[PDB]
Design a protein around this ligand. Sequence first.
Ligand SMILES: C[C@@](O)(C(=O)O)c1ccccc1
Ligand SMILES: C[C@@](O)(C(=O)O)c1ccccc1
Ligand SMILES: C[C@@](O)(C(=O)O)c1ccccc1
Ligand SMILES: C[C@@](O)(C(=O)O)c1ccccc1
Ligand SMILES: [Mg+2]
Ligand SMILES: [Mg+2]
Ligand SMILES: [Mg+2]
Ligand SMILES: [Mg+2]
Lengths: 357, 357, 357, 357
Amino acid sequence: EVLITGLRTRAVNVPLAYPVHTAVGTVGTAPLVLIDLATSAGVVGHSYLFAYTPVALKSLKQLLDDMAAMIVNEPLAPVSLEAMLAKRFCLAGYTGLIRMAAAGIDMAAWDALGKVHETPLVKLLGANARPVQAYDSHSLDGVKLATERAVTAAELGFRAVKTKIGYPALDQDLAVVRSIRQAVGDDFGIMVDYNQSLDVPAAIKRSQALQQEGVTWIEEPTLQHDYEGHQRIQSKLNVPVQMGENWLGPEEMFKALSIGACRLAMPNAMKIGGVTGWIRASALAQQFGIPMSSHLFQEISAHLLAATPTAHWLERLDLAGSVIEPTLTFEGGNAVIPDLPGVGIIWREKEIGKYLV
Amino acid sequence: EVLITGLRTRAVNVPLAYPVHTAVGTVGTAPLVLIDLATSAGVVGHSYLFAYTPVALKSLKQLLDDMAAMIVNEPLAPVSLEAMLAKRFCLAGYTGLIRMAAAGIDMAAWDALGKVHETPLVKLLGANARPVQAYDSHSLDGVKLATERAVTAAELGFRAVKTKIGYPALDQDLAVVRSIRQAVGDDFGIMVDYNQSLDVPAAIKRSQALQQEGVTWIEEPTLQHDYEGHQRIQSKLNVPVQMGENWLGPEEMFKALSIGACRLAMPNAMKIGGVTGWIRASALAQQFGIPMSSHLFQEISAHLLAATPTAHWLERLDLAGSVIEPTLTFEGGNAVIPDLPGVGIIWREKEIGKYLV
Amino acid sequence: EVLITGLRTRAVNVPLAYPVHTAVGTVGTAPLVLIDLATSAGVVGHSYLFAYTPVALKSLKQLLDDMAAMIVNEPLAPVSLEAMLAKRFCLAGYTGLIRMAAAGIDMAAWDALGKVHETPLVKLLGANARPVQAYDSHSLDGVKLATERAVTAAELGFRAVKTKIGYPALDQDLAVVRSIRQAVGDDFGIMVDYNQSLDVPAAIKRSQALQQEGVTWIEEPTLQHDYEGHQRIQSKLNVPVQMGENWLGPEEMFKALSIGACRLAMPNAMKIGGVTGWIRASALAQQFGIPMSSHLFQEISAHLLAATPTAHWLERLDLAGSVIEPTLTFEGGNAVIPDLPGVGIIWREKEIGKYLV
Amino acid sequence: EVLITGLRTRAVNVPLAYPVHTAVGTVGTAPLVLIDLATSAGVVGHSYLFAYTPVALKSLKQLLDDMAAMIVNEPLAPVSLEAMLAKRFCLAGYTGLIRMAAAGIDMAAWDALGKVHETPLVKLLGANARPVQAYDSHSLDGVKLATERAVTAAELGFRAVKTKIGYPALDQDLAVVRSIRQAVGDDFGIMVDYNQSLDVPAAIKRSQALQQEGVTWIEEPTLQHDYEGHQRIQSKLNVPVQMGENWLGPEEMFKALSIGACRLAMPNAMKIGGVTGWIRASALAQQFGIPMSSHLFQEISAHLLAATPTAHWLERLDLAGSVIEPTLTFEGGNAVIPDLPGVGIIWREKEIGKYLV
Ligand SMILES: C[C@@](O)(C(=O)O)c1ccccc1
Ligand SMILES: C[C@@](O)(C(=O)O)c1ccccc1
Ligand SMILES: C[C@@](O)(C(=O)O)c1ccccc1
Ligand SMILES: C[C@@](O)(C(=O)O)c1ccccc1
Ligand SMILES: [Mg+2]
Ligand SMILES: [Mg+2]
Ligand SMILES: [Mg+2]
Ligand SMILES: [Mg+2]
């Protein structure tokens, strides 16, 4: 009855604020692909994609433009849609860019299915809107700016910030961490992110030191695909090893969890397979006794997490704010889901035009 | 001293012959991306990429065009190059399309490094050119055509063909297999490919039946990423489970081998990471006691396999023949490496122009 | 096209400097076998072998003299050569002295293949020359001399020395370690080597104490072949257990890594199988997330490590300096690969004659 | 009180009879090193070593000549001696040629310790002389000669022969096996030896076929050091996988047994560490529920096996017969230990002189 009637994509390069100086590389602007999925019902669904690097921007768009044919005239059934894409790419590799594109479609699809029903996504999922404690996500900003950015966080009501470490010397890592703690006090969270920049032995040395300082969690210490490696690091700690931003599909998640690679997880809405993949990852975490947090996509992650049995933390890191309405809000360090059908994504057309690639 | 000075790409849609009717989907023409990598030495390296589906053709090209910047002015050092790309994409995901593109670059790089030295690739790798038994690769062609295509194979000196099964009924699978055997006799190889089209239990039922018929190997019975699944199937057989065409990187290989997912392997030159990744996969197979065969890219695979300690079979499946010279040859069902520097890839410019996308 | 035309060997007993008083036994002079491998191309390849003890000197030479027949008239293809030797000794045992001799041949072969191409080895391997942090390797020298030898190290720009411990009493071990630290400060590396001189329980007691003192790594605590044992020791530590100097072939490496016997590795160019074996060990370390350092053969190790994805530390321990040119250099505690084709080994004929056995 | 006063070695190249055409390579004459170990007691101990290949003959001798110094003036205490050699070579590698030489010394030492006591070795070991069923060991002799050689065996009272297979085709393997069976009947043993000439998958195919024919055991199907590999093969069979001729030390044995690599074992007196190592391997087999047979050295193996709790089969393969007295005898396919002190090795001085290298 409800058919997908079209797919429109726009590739922009949006302004951020600070610029995710990461534990390995850094980011000035943000490359995104905005997605409009048209339906026979007179409702348009929305989503966006993050390209990490501009190198992949035109590619990711071109890929979606070419997939539009596969999905038009198909029924608006995300679960079915997803299955169909998985069979169509089984040879090329239903992962990477292909999977990210599929995820963008799923997200829009679910958004449109939410509007069809004049219901907020979380509600459609069968749950009640609840706030979610979130943490302010910073970068590899050095002692001073890291410290400055945390006082502001807390000033805005945040109860934890996340900072990027992995300086040439463990000593620097610590420096940064201590300055923030002094600035904010013992009743505050400090999550650190090594951005997969260390080897296993080094991660053990550094993590132990930090453990002492009292970090909330140590995220992506080594190469992301090295599950076993992560297990080895974790095995030497009390503090939780955090991971999962790079899991392409619930299938990669399953693998990592199967070996006890981590104590916490934080799937990425795009990489995990959109709404459809999330639901699945959430069931996994549950069975595995893994508190599940989010990575980017605060808009949809807010709804998603409220339907997650082991929901943990939402990550505040506004990639898309310059081109969308400020529907998602934060009340006392807790994200509040807007009371709008679907995900609550409303475009800022005039701005969009400013950043078109 | 030797620098990369440029990257040119052309996307064509080449004519094949028969059309890889596969155990799940089928292929009429072939979408490729041809790569020219220019050097300060006045030598151009070559490679090509297979896109499986035209959906990904423009995308894959656009991706390479955008990566050209990363590699220009870099030294012509494939091993170093590769490392550098791996750090640059650690966030986006050094797999999928990104990895395939990286592999295409590596292949060209190694080709150019071979010309720089006026030496054939295999030679540069430290080995001697030797023929490699190959098998003629067919598709899901039905009883009649499968049978017709095998008599010809053997007529051309082949000692084994590979066919695609996975018909709605096990009975059909068998039919196809028996007709070929009758046509060719007991002293002939028959490799079957299910193209990841079955569940685990069904693969056990079907594989056992075939086991009886005497197949050389059962390839990709279930979903490719389901390593454990493959282990379960294998555990119930005597005949070898074959896999590895979808392993994106030696890192995915390692995982599968670690659980004893298969008895044989056949990495894909593109997906495994080009020459650089191959060398690594080959060391793995060795330690693991896994006879290693190839998947597509007969041109480079010929050289590659001769430097493989556990070299098994080369797969004949000419994707690129319409746009390149017939340097690779087959003598009595054995592939013969041409005595040309590099890989031996020479373009057919006039033809290329015919298929430009 | 390029054939091996001859094999010449000379056995010398070279002067050292200090004399590797080891955590079990000690060394005054150095017994080596120098290898010249002649080719149809008018290029001679070089390598040398270390005999550890003079007991094995004449034996090792005699063994190479007798193998010369096997390799003459063979093509200059190290990878092929190596395979051929492995089949020829499968009965006698392709390990021990036999393997060491094979490794010496491989090394020369690769050196000659580098000259054939007027290219530095590392370059031929596909990588870029880069410096490698190295550490000055000392012996079981006692408190005073150990301390004296470190001040000089650092004076020469080294950032870490390695010392031999394993005194009758843990107290002595510590003494030595503390004196060096005082002498050099907290920003300096101290690697310790027990030379396989302890039992498992004792290694646990001693390693824990040292862990406190802050050693960089604990190397070969127990009998080298006792992998499991090493795993037990490691399991009780935070500090890395280092091993691999005695691994005869990548096959022994694989075994040790398979059980998690260590956190770091340091293969020996000779024992691991020359260039050919190295390439393989390096792929293993990679997959296993094991930072790989070297053992002896600083000349070739320098090139080797630059092509190692998980390259760690180069060990400075000049066995051969009295009979070769000072091509390898150290700039600020980093080894610099000479810009000479092959490995860069140039003999000092007049000196050689002084030490001929 | 009893000291070792000297070590004499002679390297001969002895005539055989048939010539161990092996499942990979073949042998015309036999290269041995005969050992005389002098004592303060006026008793000379004896042993011999097998060099597999003449390539290693001069080397092995030279090695023993150089070790003589280490052992002279030492007490005639094999157990202590052995320990001492193990510490002295811990750096060079107490395996390979070095270990073989050590084993030759141990064997002589024990022989001399037997003469000192005017007691037969087995007796000194604490056991009673008993016959041991043995099997006649043949080579890769083809259908006809294999068949001829078995009729004779049985004619001489043997109840089982061992033949070498591994022909280019499984069909040949079978041919050979069937002809012998026809020739001898169902109440006869047929042990087959693949000489490590197959890959894992192929070994599974071939072994299963043979299993059908009814072989006594399948020996060294794949590369000897590939324990895991052997475990995989064994796991697919009912018939016993036999191995252990290449285990250098009880330490290599332990490893293989630990993973269930085989159902039977057959250590080599030389490679396992002489008498001293045997005693140890025998305790291992016992605990592991592994029937233990021998490899070469029928003279000492006869005594050894009678002191083995899980003693199985003795292998008849007379390497040394041309230079020693016919003390060891066979009565009805059972080896009979001579009633002479020590091992019973008496040289044939006049003959020795004929084969001196
Ligand atoms: C640091 C990071 O891994 C995170 O935790 O959010 C991150 C990665 C990529 C883009 C933005 C942020
Ligand atoms: C059937 C196949 O998996 C193979 O074995 O080659 C194949 C897959 C994709 C394209 C061509 C061929
Ligand atoms: C101490 C040592 O094991 C090392 O680490 O180099 C060593 C062993 C043998 C010879 C020289 C040095
Ligand atoms: C075939 C063999 O492995 C055996 O079983 O004895 C053998 C190996 C080496 C020399 C002689 C015999
Ligand atoms: Mg992160
Ligand atoms: Mg296939
Ligand atoms: Mg050491
Ligand atoms: Mg044998």
